[PDB]
Amino acid sequence: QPLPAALVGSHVRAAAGTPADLATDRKFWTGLSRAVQERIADDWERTREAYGAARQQHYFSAEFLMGRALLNNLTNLGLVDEAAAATRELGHELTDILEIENDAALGNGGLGRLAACFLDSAVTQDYPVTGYGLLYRFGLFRQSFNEGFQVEKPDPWREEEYPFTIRRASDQLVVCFDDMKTRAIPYDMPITGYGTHNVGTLRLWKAEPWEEFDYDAFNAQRFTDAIIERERVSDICRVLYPNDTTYEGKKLRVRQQYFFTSASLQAMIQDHLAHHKDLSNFAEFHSVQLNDTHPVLAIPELMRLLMDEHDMGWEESWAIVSKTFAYTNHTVLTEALEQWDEQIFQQLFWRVWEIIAEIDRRFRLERAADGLDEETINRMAPIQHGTVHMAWIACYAAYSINGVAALHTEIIKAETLADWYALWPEKFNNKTNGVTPRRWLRMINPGLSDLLTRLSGSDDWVTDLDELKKLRSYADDKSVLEELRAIKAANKQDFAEWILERQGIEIDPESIFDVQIKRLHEYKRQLMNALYVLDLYFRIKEDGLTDIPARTVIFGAKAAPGYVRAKAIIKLINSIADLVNNDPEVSPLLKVVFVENYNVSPAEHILPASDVSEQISTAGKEASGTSNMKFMMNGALTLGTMDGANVEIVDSVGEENAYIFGARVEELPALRESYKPYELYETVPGLKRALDALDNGTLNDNNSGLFYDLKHSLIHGYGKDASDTYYVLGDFADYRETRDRMAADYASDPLGWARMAWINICESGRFSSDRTIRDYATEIWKLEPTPA
C-alpha cells in the first residue's frame, strides 16, 4: 500500500530510537522523508539507466533555489493524502512535520529559482537533464531584524540529517589547485515529477580537505594553525556569493567555480567512458548549458581533461568543446559581465591558465584571418588589459547563445554582444523564462487547482498549462467568478493566520493584498512603493481620505550586506510600518507587513493570497521577471512598468487586464536629460510632505542618519547627473495615479476585478517552464523524451 503507517513508522523508529508516536517532529520528518526515498529508489535507478543510454544535457549553475523538498515530492508522487493519513495515525500532524524543513539554501534569487523550475519541467517531460552545482552549507545569509535594521547571519539547512541529498563518498574525485588539493564529494538530490515515474538528479558537490586537519600542528597545540587549511577548503562550500571586494575574496569566488565545474566534468567523463569506448564522441551524447558566466571555467577545464588525461589533440578537443557548450545571457548590460585578473588563474591553476592563454592566442589569429581589425579583436578577446573576460570565452566556445525574452534577446544582439552576433548570427536565439506550474500553482493553491480541474475535466493542466486557455470562456460565467473570489479570500484568510503565527501581526483578511517580493535594489524602487505608502498615510490622517478599500502592503526582500542604501530602504519600510500599524486613525485602512527572510517557502504562502503584484522597476532595467509570472498564475493583477515580463503579460491579457504606468524605456533619455527632481519635490502635491517626513522626526531611524541620506539621494542634483538615478520621483505621480485607480476598481467592481484575474490565470500557460524546457530541449540540446 502507498505509504502505509507501517512503512513510515519503520523509518521513523530507525531515526528516533523510540516508537514512532513518541518521536519528535524533527525525527518524524526524517522518517517520513526516508519513506519517500525508499519508494522512489527503484524509479530513480530506472531513470538513471534510461538517461545513461540517451543523449544528455548537463545544466551547470552556481545556484539552485530548491526550497523545501517534502511537500513537493509528496505532491508529484500523489501521496499527500496517504502521508496525511499515515502521519495522523502515528500521532502527528503533517502540517507541523512539513514546517520542520528549512528551504535548501542552495541558491540566491531568480537565476537559481529558474534552474530549479527547469529541473522540475525537465523530468515532468522525461528529458534526460541533470543539474550540477555546489552544495552550499550556509546559503547566502539568513535575514533577521534588530530594531528595524537588517542583520545577516549564517543560513544552515542540512546540519541535521537530510535524506533528500545522498552522499556518495566512494565516488569522490580530486580537484587539485596549485595551492590546495581537495576532495570532491558528490551528492545526489532526487527530482520528482508530477504525472511521471522519472526521477531526475541534481548533483551537488561538497569540498573536503585531503587531511581532516594538521595533526602535527594540533599536537603541538597550535590549535588555529591546525585547521587553517581545513577551513580554507571548507570555504569553497560555506556560503553562496561570498563578498569579493578584496583579492582573496575574488580568488575564493574563482575557486568555487573551478571546483564544481572540474568535479562535474570529471564525473561526466567517467560516466561516458562507462557507456562508450572513448571521448571522441562526447559531444554526440552530451551537451552542457552554462547558466550565466559562473560556470565558464568548464570550458578550459574540459580542454585540459581531454588533452592532458585522454591524450587528445587541441583541434579535436576544441571541436568537442565547441559542440558541447551552450551559453545563456541574463542581463541587457555589460556590467556584471564577469571579469577576472589573470593572476588569479595563474595562481590557482597554472595549467588551466596556459589553456585560457592558448584560447586567446588562437582566437586573435583566427579573427585576423576572418579579416577583423585590431580594435575589434582587442575588444572581443578573452584576455585584455591583464583581465580575463569570461563572457567572451563563452561566446567564442558556445554553439548557442540565448537571451531569456524577446526584447532582451534583441538587445544582446544589437548591443551587449553585438560583435559576436556580427561574426556568428546563427548562434543567437531566444528562450523565454518561465516557472513551474507544480510548485507555484498546484502545490500552493489547491483551492484554485480544484476549480481548474473541475472546469477542464482533469488535472492534465498541471503538466500542460496552455490547457487553461480553454477556460477563458468562463470569464463571463458569474458563478465561476464568484468561486474565484471565494478562493482568493480563503487563501487570504490562510495568509493572515500564517503571518500572525510567524511575526505576531494582525491584518485584515478582506483588505487588498498589495505585494512586492523582490530583492532590494534601488532600481527595483521598493523605495517608490514606500513613498506611496507614506503619502497615503498622510492623505488618510491629515487630508481626510476615506472613500477607499482597506489594504495591506506586503514586503519581502533581502538586501546585499554592503549595500548601504538598500539596507536603509529596508529600515525605512520597517519604520513606516511602525508609524502606520500603531496609528489607530490609519491602521483600519492601511497596514504594512515586512515578511522577514523572504525565500521560497515564504513565497509559497504569499502568492496564493496576493491581489496586486508590484513590478515597478525603472523601465529598461528588467530583462525578465519570473515572480511576475507566479503572481499571474495565482490570480493577482500586475501593477507595473512596461518592462521585462510585464510586456509579455500585457501582450497576453491586454492593456485592459493589467495596470501599466510610468515612462517607457525609449522616453527616459529625454526625461533624464532635463530631469528636475528637486522641482518635483517642491511641486507634486503631497511629495514635499512625504519626503520631509524622512528627516522631520515623523519616522525614526534610531539616530542612524539613514533616512536623511535617502531623502537627498532622491532630491539632490538635476539633469542626467541627478542623484535619483532610477527616476523614482519622476514616475511617482503616474505611479500613485495608477495605484489609486487600481484600488478603486477593486472596491467598486468586485466581479470586474475577478474577471481580469481569471483572464490572467487562463493566459498564464504562456509562462510555464515546460514550454521553455521543450524549446531548450528541441532547439539547443536536441533531446528526446526518455521514460524510465
- The catalytic site residues sit at 330, 518-519, 524, 626, 630
Which of ligand PLP, its own copies, none lies near 299, with the C-beta cut-off 5 to 8 A by kind?
A: none
Using CB under 6 A as the binding rule, whether residue 143 contacts ligand PLP is answered as no
What is the total count of residues that contact its own copies (CB under 8 A)? 68
The correct pick among 89, 235, 358, 583 for binding its own copies (CB under 8 A) is: 235
Cα–Cα distance, 368 to 376 (Å, whole number): 10
Using CB under 6 A as the binding rule, whether residue 109 contacts ligand PLP is answered as yes
Using CB under 6 A as the binding rule, whether residue 722 contacts ligand PLP is answered as no
Considering only residues 279 to 318 of the shown chain, the ones binding its own copies according to CB under 8 A are none
Using CB under 8 A as the binding rule, whether residue 246 contacts its own copies is answered as yes
Residues for the chain: how many in total?
788
605 neighbors 498 (Cβ within 8 angstroms): yes
Return the amino acid letter for 582: N
Q: Which of 417, 419, 390 is nearest to 403 (CA)?
A: 417
On whether 627 is known to bind a ligand per the annotation, the reply is yes
Considering only residues 530 to 569 of the shown chain, the ones binding its own copies according to CB under 8 A are 561-562
Q: In 10 A of CB 220, how many CB atoms?
A: 11
Task: Please state the closest distance from residue 326 (CB atom) to its own copies, in A.
Answer: 29
Cα–Cα distance, 684 to 48 (Å, whole number): 63
Using CB under 8 A as the binding rule, whether residue 200 contacts its own copies is answered as no
Chain centroid offset of residue 280 CA = 36
Which of ligand PLP, its own copies, none lies near 223, with the C-beta cut-off 5 to 8 A by kind?
A: its own copies
Q: Output 356 or 595, the one with its CB closest to ligand PLP.
A: 595
> Which residue has 543560513 as its cell numbers?
155
The correct pick among 66, 252, 557, 580 for binding its own copies (CB under 8 A) is: 252
Cα–Cα distance, 689 to 681 (Å, whole number): 9
What is the total count of residues that contact ligand PLP (CB under 6 A)? 14
Using CB under 8 A as the binding rule, whether residue 10 contacts its own copies is answered as yes
Cα–Cα distance, 311 to 170 (Å, whole number): 26
Q: Output 393 or 520, the one with its CB closest to ligand PLP.
A: 520
Pairing of strands 339-341, 200-209: unpaired
Which of ligand PLP, its own copies, none lies near 603, with the C-beta cut-off 5 to 8 A by kind?
A: ligand PLP
Using CB under 8 A as the binding rule, whether residue 42 contacts its own copies is answered as yes
Return the amino acid letter for 78: G
Task: Please state the closest distance from residue 555 (CB atom) to ligand PLP, in A.
Answer: 13
On whether 518 is known to bind a ligand per the annotation, the reply is yes
Stretch that binds its own copies, among 22-30, 119-127, 454-462, 467-475 (CB under 8 A): 22-30
Return the amino acid letter for 717: G
Which of its own copies, ligand PLP, none lies near 221, with the C-beta cut-off 5 to 8 A by kind?
A: its own copies
Take residue 338 and report the three cell numbers written for it. 564577469
Task: Please state the closest distance from residue 621 (CB atom) to ligand PLP, in A.
Answer: 12
Return the amino acid letter for 38: E
Question: 719 in the Ramachandran plot: left (φ > 0), alpha (ψ -120 to 50) or beta?
Answer: left
Residue 151 bridge partners (DSSP): 144
Using CB under 6 A as the binding rule, whether residue 641 contacts ligand PLP is answered as no
Residue 471's alpha-carbon distances to 2, 453, 459, 488, 559, in angstroms, are 33, 11, 13, 18, 40
Residue 384 bridge partners (DSSP): 387
Using CB under 8 A as the binding rule, whether residue 671 contacts its own copies is answered as no
Using CB under 6 A as the binding rule, whether residue 599 contacts ligand PLP is answered as yes
Stretch that binds ligand PLP, among 37-45, 314-322, 626-634, 694-702 (CB under 6 A): 626-634
Cα–Cα distance, 757 to 608 (Å, whole number): 12
Task: Please state the closest distance from residue 358 (CB atom) to its own copies, in A.
Answer: 31
Cα–Cα distance, 369 to 376 (Å, whole number): 13
Chain centroid offset of residue 323 CA = 28
Q: Which of 528, 527, 453, 437 is nearest to 487 (CA)?
A: 453
Take residue 533 and report the three cell numbers written for it. 505608502
Question: 344: which residues sit within 8 A by CB, 6+ positions away?
Answer: 247, 250, 251, 254
Describe the crossing of helices 478-503 and 446-456 by its angle, rounded to 10 degrees: 160
Using CB under 6 A as the binding rule, whether residue 110 contacts ligand PLP is answered as yes
Task: Please state the closest distance from residue 111 (CB atom) to ligand PLP, in A.
Answer: 8
Using CB under 8 A as the binding rule, whether residue 244 contacts its own copies is answered as yes
Q: Which of 102, 103, 100, 95 is nearest to 26 (CA)?
A: 100
Task: Please state the closest distance from residue 708 (CB atom) to its own copies, in A.
Answer: 25
- Which residues make up the interface to its own copies (CB under 8 A)? 7, 10-11, 13-19, 22, 24, 26, 34-35, 37-38, 40-42, 44-45, 48, 138, 141, 152-154, 156, 159-161, 163, 166-167, 169-170, 188, 190, 211-213, 215-216, 218-221, 223-224, 227-228, 231-232, 234-235, 238-239, 242-246, 248-249, 252, 561-562
Which residue positions form the known binding site? 518, 627
Which residue positions form the known binding site for pyridoxal 5'-phosphate? 518, 627
- Which residues make up the interface to ligand PLP (CB under 6 A)? 65, 109-110, 113, 518-519, 599-600, 603, 625-628, 630
